[PDB]
Symmetry: D2
Subunit: 298 residues, 4 copies
Amino acid sequence: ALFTGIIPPVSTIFTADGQLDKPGTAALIDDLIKAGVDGLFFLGSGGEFSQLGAEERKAIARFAIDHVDRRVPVLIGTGGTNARETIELSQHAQQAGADGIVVINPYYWKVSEANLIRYFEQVADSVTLPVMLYNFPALTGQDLTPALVKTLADSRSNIIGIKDTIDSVAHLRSMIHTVKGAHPHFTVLCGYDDHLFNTLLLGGDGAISASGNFAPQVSVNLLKAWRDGDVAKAAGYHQTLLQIPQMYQLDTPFVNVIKEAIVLCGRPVSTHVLPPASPLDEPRKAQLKTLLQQLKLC
Amino acid sequence: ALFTGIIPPVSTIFTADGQLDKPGTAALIDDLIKAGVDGLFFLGSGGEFSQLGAEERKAIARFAIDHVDRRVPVLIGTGGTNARETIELSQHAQQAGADGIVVINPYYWKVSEANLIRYFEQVADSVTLPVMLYNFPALTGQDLTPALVKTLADSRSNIIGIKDTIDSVAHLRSMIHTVKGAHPHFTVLCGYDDHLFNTLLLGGDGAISASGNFAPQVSVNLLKAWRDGDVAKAAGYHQTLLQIPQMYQLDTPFVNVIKEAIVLCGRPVSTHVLPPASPLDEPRKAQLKTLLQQLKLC
Amino acid sequence: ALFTGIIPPVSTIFTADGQLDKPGTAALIDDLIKAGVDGLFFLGSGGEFSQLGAEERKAIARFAIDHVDRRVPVLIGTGGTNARETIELSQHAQQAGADGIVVINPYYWKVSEANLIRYFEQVADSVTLPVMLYNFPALTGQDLTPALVKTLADSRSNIIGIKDTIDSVAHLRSMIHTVKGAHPHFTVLCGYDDHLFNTLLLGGDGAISASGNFAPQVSVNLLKAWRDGDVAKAAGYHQTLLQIPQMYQLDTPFVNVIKEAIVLCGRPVSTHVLPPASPLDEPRKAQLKTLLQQLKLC
Amino acid sequence: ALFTGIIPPVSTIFTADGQLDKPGTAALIDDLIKAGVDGLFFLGSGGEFSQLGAEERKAIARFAIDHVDRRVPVLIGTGGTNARETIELSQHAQQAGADGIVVINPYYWKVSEANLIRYFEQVADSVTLPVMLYNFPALTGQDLTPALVKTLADSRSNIIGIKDTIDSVAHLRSMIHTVKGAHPHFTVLCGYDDHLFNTLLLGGDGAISASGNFAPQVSVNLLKAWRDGDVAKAAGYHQTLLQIPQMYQLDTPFVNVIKEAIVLCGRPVSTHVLPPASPLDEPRKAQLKTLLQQLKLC
Ligand SMILES: *[C@@H](C[C@H](O)[C@@H](O)CO)C(=O)O
Ligand SMILES: *[C@H](C[C@H](O)[C@@H](O)CO)C(=O)O
Ligand SMILES: *[C@H](C[C@H](O)[C@@H](O)CO)C(=O)O
Ligand SMILES: *[C@H](C[C@H](O)[C@@H](O)CO)C(=O)O
């Protein structure tokens, strides 16, 4: 029930000096809302939270929540390694008017299970907002297993969902059976574009995926088709989404690629990104372009 | 060769409210310098850099460098995921009087090899201090391979060493043969207590390891015995260091364990640690104590 | 394009003394062929090749080829760690009448790339039969990357396909774009049930998956529906396949589970399995049964 | 304590046609016994067990036991993935007069813990010989944890040791503390040359390592020096053993390297290896030679 459907992890647009580009972030927000998304997620991996300072993250969230102005539910990513900062950023998000926070597990130290449960319990106790967990074991080095997530949802009634970013049908399936089986309204969202369709067929709730920035219409139409019972139309959109993640191989981090994609699909924003990411080179931008053209996305 | 010998990663002592405990950190620094260490390293993993804000880190470094007062070479850990903050903290360290900085690879995104080389070169070019790399793949999920380290030392003459924190004889051997083979004065330090002896026999330069906090005499005497040609005496100290790391299994993070050991070995400092670390329980503190007694360290 | 469509990895039926159960394996083969499969694959992981001796494997292959009697194409798994034995089994297979061989990479030693290419080239040179590569990195510890596989298909014109057994959309998608892009008639089959549909939509050719033994009709009808352009009907069958692999968690190895399922779905065969696999306990058999009933498969 | 001290995993010498070279294997066995080793281990990873058929393995063990003629204790490696074959090879070893068997875990399927404990209990019940376990998780993909090993020693009184092949001080220390702490006469042997000294200082029992083939005097003298209380002398030998494993990087599998080193150090045996290993090229042979010369081994 909370935060279901298509919720893009919005890119943060920066100027050439690495300050928040308010007109470009605002235009991107407005494109997304006009495309019919179900909510917006700021300061996720795509939004570059890990390359920003805490004061910067507060300013971005505040701007973003204000610009959205309640048109769609807003989530703010408040996680990191500094747990005291995670509480600060989460309390700031609630005060600023966000609808929910998304909290990754600490990704430097892989803390013991007892420390990890305590960390999420404390973060959840610091706010009255709904809390979405964030699994990204390829970057964190520490999986949030279905059993662990179930124990968290048993322990705190404001822990109401998960963004599960993993290329694994078994992990999504098992997350759904174990957690939604005990908690029917717990939300399961996949973090990869090419798992949206399977997520839905498995009993999950939608996606928070990078292609939400530059082709939201494909995910939004997939979901609308699926909700209407037109499974073949849904499967047609899925065939596009199956191919999209090729582009993510172009660079790592690929936050540059997603911005270059937003431009190519018709929204001229500054593509600047924060170190240690770097501008995409021209030959790879052309490769991105041919991929987008083959998929009829620009 | 810069920063060789025994260089503890000093614990940061905090009060119950999580603020820097100045008298306790100072007492700890003084004990360590009296024990005959060759340098001090503040805000490494043991010093809890990843649970501290940037302004807290600057304050800690400033205090520590000031208290040390040039009695031994001082290293400051400046790394993180936010590269702009890395440059800020590194430039701050230089201006505050540090003798070198210690920079881990970004540990959220495992960035491409080209972004990674470009990150270290930018960090190096932001200061005129010597730079020590920090490899801790168990936590980062991205190894700094001997071939990669060699390429950084070939590219920047102020990248002069590495702290290699890995339980692997092969990795230390290869780091020494590959990098010290091209760069005879490049410093190789192990990050685990039980690899100090082998690092020395391999042609490496010493250790930055946690037991430096609570039993610096063991490492210090091992290096002295080694430098004196008394290999059997060195090997006797090694036998104690082989056993110490058992304690690190008592909790994760084990920064709490290191502080509880500082107290048990005779220095009564506050043992508070920052979340998501937590206080060590009384039964595990009793287990630590009986271990320190069996090793004759208290 | 050779060996496309639905090709079960057939269980080998054994008696209570661990000998080939000819009547039971024959009835299983017959059920499968009547179900409309496009081929049959004996002595894969599911047929227990790794628990059988070389003479046992020759006997089983000969029986199975003779029983099939050319009704559908027959593949024999001839791989292992003993490369001399792989050539013996492969030449035996050809002499006995098989239509192709399936060859995993060596899975004890992960051999260097040069030795690996040389191994597959020698195997491929030993027979005139088509050769299907078998990638199962969860078990082998050594992935057959799309680049490597392309190199092998460039090198030997009888290396014509791959069974790719990995819960990874990216791996499938990349195998298809890289290998089929250079070699349009190179066959890509997925080894997991719940990747069949995606495999088809990505441009691949079918599946060799365990549920082919006890519910072939689901895969067969999915392929038929897809080939007819009835995508929604295909997606219906996909919804069942998405759920089936839950049963594989019951035991490891789960070759017992597969045989227990064959019985439950209406083919009473001896379920004996070779050590170190063991009989499935009754509570887990009942668990399997409830999973089959929920999916309307018995 | 059974099977302690220096026990080489003997290379199996083959003729150009891949048959057992009896004069060369015999000469190698005699060289080893003359050098003062404490036992000999045939058909481990370096003896190429995984590239041999069962009838070949039997012939080799029979020959090797017979040649040794009880001058030193003899171990035979009997493991594989075919558990019925493991029992046949182990009962054959006993009947052929072996003193013990060495049994790796199944390395294709990583069987469930319950299947793994049953496997080892069944193998141990099939003979009245002592059984040494063999941990090689880089190749097996499944670690024998100290806890699991303790459970096996609690379960069967003829499971009396382990060959722990892993570049990990923690793994050795923990195997010693957990297993030898419950079972003081259980034998812990390391499988890598550069962990012999540490294994001894940790309370362990010796090494089964590749350099036993071509330079057994180094391990033999280290152990002698250690037993004599001349720790400095032991450490001098350790310094050579720290350097030897560089050569194992020359090829993979490196069984070819080990035989080229046997020749270079003065015993002219055939260096044929079984596929998928291959002959070492001349430039790498010249590299191995200069390494052996720098270490004063030829
Ligand atoms: C989330 C979206 C996921 O994690 C990306 O990896 C691409 O789909 C995010 O926070 O950026
Ligand atoms: C360095 C010491 C290493 O990393 C620890 O893991 C323990 O010896 C540090 O910066 O803490
Ligand atoms: C192939 C089928 C694959 O590998 C299994 O893992 C089950 O889908 C086989 O050879 O058994
Ligand atoms: C044992 C020795 C180990 O496993 C090698 O890796 C080299 O010391 C063996 O059986 O070969």
